[PDB]
Coordinates of N, CA and C in Angstrom, one line a residue:
Chain A
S2 N 1.0 100.6 77.0 CA 1.9 99.9 76.2 C 3.3 100.5 76.1
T3 N 4.0 100.6 77.2 CA 5.4 101.2 77.2 C 6.4 100.2 76.7
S4 N 7.1 100.6 75.7 CA 8.2 99.7 75.2 C 9.4 99.7 76.2
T5 N 10.2 98.6 76.1 CA 11.2 98.5 77.1 C 12.4 99.4 76.9
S6 N 12.6 100.0 75.7 CA 13.6 101.0 75.5 C 13.1 102.4 75.9
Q7 N 11.8 102.6 76.0 CA 11.2 103.8 76.5 C 11.5 104.0 78.0
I8 N 11.4 102.9 78.7 CA 11.6 102.9 80.2 C 13.1 103.2 80.5
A9 N 14.0 102.9 79.6 CA 15.4 103.2 79.8 C 15.7 104.7 79.7
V10 N 14.8 105.4 79.0 CA 14.9 106.9 78.8 C 14.1 107.7 79.7
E11 N 12.9 107.3 80.0 CA 11.9 108.1 80.8 C 11.8 107.8 82.2
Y12 N 12.2 106.6 82.7 CA 11.8 106.3 84.0 C 12.9 106.6 85.0
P13 N 12.5 106.8 86.3 CA 13.6 107.1 87.3 C 14.4 105.8 87.6
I14 N 15.5 106.1 88.2 CA 16.5 105.0 88.4 C 16.4 104.5 89.9
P15 N 16.2 103.2 90.1 CA 16.2 102.7 91.5 C 17.6 102.7 92.1
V16 N 17.6 102.9 93.4 CA 18.8 103.1 94.2 C 19.6 101.8 94.4
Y17 N 19.0 100.7 94.5 CA 19.5 99.5 95.1 C 20.6 98.8 94.3
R18 N 20.8 99.1 93.1 CA 21.8 98.5 92.2 C 22.9 99.5 92.0
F19 N 24.1 99.3 92.6 CA 25.1 100.3 92.5 C 26.5 99.6 92.6
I20 N 27.5 100.3 92.0 CA 28.9 99.8 92.1 C 29.7 100.9 92.8
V21 N 30.5 100.5 93.8 CA 31.4 101.3 94.6 C 32.8 100.8 94.2
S22 N 33.7 101.8 93.9 CA 35.1 101.5 93.5 C 36.0 102.4 94.3
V23 N 36.8 101.8 95.2 CA 37.7 102.6 96.1 C 39.1 102.5 95.5
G24 N 39.5 103.5 94.8 CA 40.8 103.5 94.2 C 40.9 102.5 93.0
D25 N 41.9 101.6 93.0 CA 41.9 100.6 92.0 C 41.0 99.5 92.3
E26 N 40.8 99.2 93.5 CA 39.9 98.1 93.9 C 38.4 98.5 93.6
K27 N 37.6 97.5 93.4 CA 36.1 97.6 93.5 C 35.6 96.6 94.5
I28 N 34.9 97.1 95.5 CA 34.4 96.2 96.6 C 32.9 96.4 96.8
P29 N 32.2 95.3 97.1 CA 30.7 95.4 97.2 C 30.3 96.0 98.6
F30 N 29.5 97.0 98.5 CA 29.1 97.7 99.7 C 27.6 97.5 99.9
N31 N 27.1 97.6 101.2 CA 25.7 97.4 101.5 C 25.0 98.7 101.3
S32 N 25.6 99.8 101.7 CA 24.9 101.1 101.6 C 25.9 102.2 101.5
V33 N 25.6 103.3 100.9 CA 26.4 104.5 100.8 C 25.6 105.7 101.2
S34 N 26.1 106.6 102.1 CA 25.4 107.7 102.6 C 26.2 109.0 102.5
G35 N 25.5 110.1 102.8 CA 26.2 111.4 102.8 C 26.3 111.8 101.3
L36 N 27.5 112.3 101.0 CA 27.9 112.5 99.6 C 27.2 113.6 98.9
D37 N 26.9 114.7 99.7 CA 26.2 115.8 99.1 C 27.0 117.1 99.1
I38 N 26.7 118.0 98.1 CA 27.3 119.3 98.1 C 26.6 120.2 99.1
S39 N 27.3 121.2 99.5 CA 26.7 122.2 100.4 C 27.5 123.5 100.3
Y40 N 26.9 124.6 100.6 CA 27.5 125.9 100.6 C 27.0 126.8 101.7
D41 N 27.9 127.5 102.4 CA 27.6 128.6 103.3 C 27.1 129.7 102.5
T42 N 26.2 130.6 103.1 CA 25.7 131.7 102.4 C 26.2 133.0 103.1
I43 N 26.6 133.9 102.3 CA 27.1 135.2 102.8 C 26.0 136.3 102.5
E44 N 25.6 137.0 103.6 CA 24.6 138.0 103.5 C 25.1 139.4 103.9
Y45 N 25.0 140.3 102.9 CA 25.3 141.7 103.2 C 24.0 142.5 103.2
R46 N 23.9 143.5 104.0 CA 22.7 144.2 104.2 C 23.1 145.6 104.7
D47 N 22.7 146.6 103.9 CA 23.0 148.0 104.2 C 21.8 148.8 104.5
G48 N 22.0 150.1 104.8 CA 20.9 150.9 105.4 C 19.8 151.3 104.4
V49 N 20.1 151.4 103.1 CA 19.1 151.9 102.2 C 18.1 150.8 101.9
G50 N 18.4 149.5 102.2 CA 17.3 148.5 102.1 C 17.7 147.3 101.3
Chain B
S2 N -0.1 41.0 96.7 CA 0.3 40.1 97.7 C 1.5 40.6 98.5
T3 N 1.3 41.6 99.4 CA 2.4 42.1 100.2 C 2.5 41.3 101.4
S4 N 3.8 40.8 101.7 CA 4.1 40.1 102.9 C 4.0 41.0 104.1
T5 N 3.9 40.4 105.3 CA 3.7 41.2 106.5 C 5.0 41.8 107.0
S6 N 6.2 41.2 106.6 CA 7.4 41.8 106.9 C 7.8 42.9 105.9
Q7 N 7.2 42.9 104.7 CA 7.4 44.0 103.8 C 6.7 45.3 104.2
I8 N 5.6 45.2 104.9 CA 4.9 46.4 105.4 C 5.6 47.0 106.5
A9 N 6.4 46.2 107.3 CA 7.2 46.8 108.4 C 8.4 47.6 107.8
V10 N 8.8 47.4 106.6 CA 9.9 48.2 106.0 C 9.4 49.3 105.1
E11 N 8.3 49.1 104.3 CA 7.9 50.0 103.3 C 6.8 51.0 103.7
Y12 N 6.1 50.7 104.6 CA 4.8 51.4 104.8 C 5.0 52.6 105.8
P13 N 4.2 53.6 105.7 CA 4.3 54.7 106.6 C 3.8 54.3 108.0
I14 N 4.1 55.1 109.0 CA 3.9 54.8 110.4 C 2.6 55.5 110.8
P15 N 1.6 54.9 111.4 CA 0.4 55.6 111.9 C 0.8 56.3 113.3
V16 N 0.1 57.5 113.5 CA 0.5 58.3 114.6 C -0.1 57.9 115.9
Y17 N -1.2 57.1 115.9 CA -2.0 57.0 117.1 C -1.4 56.1 118.2
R18 N -0.3 55.3 117.9 CA 0.3 54.5 118.9 C 1.6 55.0 119.3
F19 N 1.8 55.5 120.5 CA 3.0 56.2 120.9 C 3.2 56.1 122.4
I20 N 4.4 56.2 122.8 CA 4.8 56.1 124.2 C 5.5 57.4 124.6
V21 N 5.0 58.1 125.6 CA 5.6 59.3 126.2 C 6.2 59.0 127.5
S22 N 7.4 59.4 127.7 CA 8.2 59.1 129.0 C 8.8 60.4 129.5
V23 N 8.3 60.8 130.7 CA 8.7 62.1 131.2 C 9.7 61.8 132.4
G24 N 11.0 62.0 132.1 CA 12.0 61.7 133.1 C 12.1 60.2 133.3
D25 N 12.1 59.8 134.5 CA 12.1 58.4 134.8 C 10.7 57.7 134.7
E26 N 9.7 58.5 134.9 CA 8.3 58.0 134.7 C 8.0 57.8 133.3
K27 N 7.0 56.9 133.0 CA 6.3 56.9 131.7 C 4.8 57.0 132.0
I28 N 4.2 57.9 131.4 CA 2.8 58.2 131.6 C 2.0 58.2 130.3
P29 N 0.8 57.7 130.3 CA 0.0 57.6 129.1 C -0.6 59.0 128.8
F30 N -0.4 59.5 127.5 CA -0.9 60.8 127.1 C -1.9 60.6 126.0
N31 N -2.8 61.6 125.9 CA -3.8 61.5 124.8 C -3.3 62.1 123.5
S32 N -2.5 63.2 123.6 CA -2.0 63.7 122.4 C -0.7 64.5 122.7
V33 N 0.2 64.6 121.8 CA 1.4 65.4 121.9 C 1.4 66.4 120.7
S34 N 1.8 67.6 120.9 CA 1.7 68.6 119.8 C 3.0 69.5 119.9
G35 N 3.2 70.3 118.9 CA 4.4 71.1 118.8 C 5.6 70.3 118.3
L36 N 6.7 70.5 119.1 CA 7.9 69.6 119.0 C 8.6 69.7 117.7
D37 N 8.7 70.9 117.1 CA 9.3 71.0 115.8 C 10.6 71.9 115.9
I38 N 11.5 71.7 115.0 CA 12.7 72.5 114.9 C 12.3 73.8 114.1
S39 N 13.0 74.8 114.3 CA 12.8 76.1 113.5 C 14.1 76.9 113.5
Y40 N 14.3 77.7 112.5 CA 15.5 78.6 112.4 C 15.1 79.9 111.9
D41 N 15.6 81.0 112.5 CA 15.6 82.3 111.8 C 16.5 82.3 110.7
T42 N 16.2 83.2 109.7 CA 17.1 83.3 108.5 C 17.7 84.7 108.5
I43 N 19.0 84.7 108.2 CA 19.8 85.9 108.1 C 20.0 86.2 106.6
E44 N 19.7 87.4 106.2 CA 19.8 87.8 104.8 C 20.7 89.0 104.7
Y45 N 21.8 88.9 104.0 CA 22.7 89.9 103.6 C 22.5 90.2 102.1
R46 N 22.6 91.5 101.7 CA 22.3 91.9 100.4 C 23.1 93.2 100.1
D47 N 24.0 93.1 99.2 CA 24.8 94.3 98.9 C 24.5 94.8 97.5
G48 N 25.3 95.9 97.1 CA 24.9 96.7 96.0 C 25.2 96.1 94.6
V49 N 26.1 95.1 94.5 CA 26.5 94.6 93.3 C 25.5 93.5 92.8
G50 N 24.6 93.0 93.7 CA 23.5 92.2 93.3 C 23.4 90.9 94.0

């Protein structure tokens, strides 16, 4: 017996309903991809271990 | 008391009496099947709903 306000707090969000807004315009899009953070890694390693 | 000219206007048509004509020839056939229209459906769906 989950209440309908409990689902708004506990449940994951489905992807298919989204708003894309390009600048001042907002335009309906079929899909959005990419959009991820990434970092190169720097590795130092010396002789003592 | 339906008149016989009212049946020609209001009543449905029975299937069993038909004429098939292939090109210039007309030839008697036992049954005809298929012969229907059909269309694929194209569905677009974007993010605003």
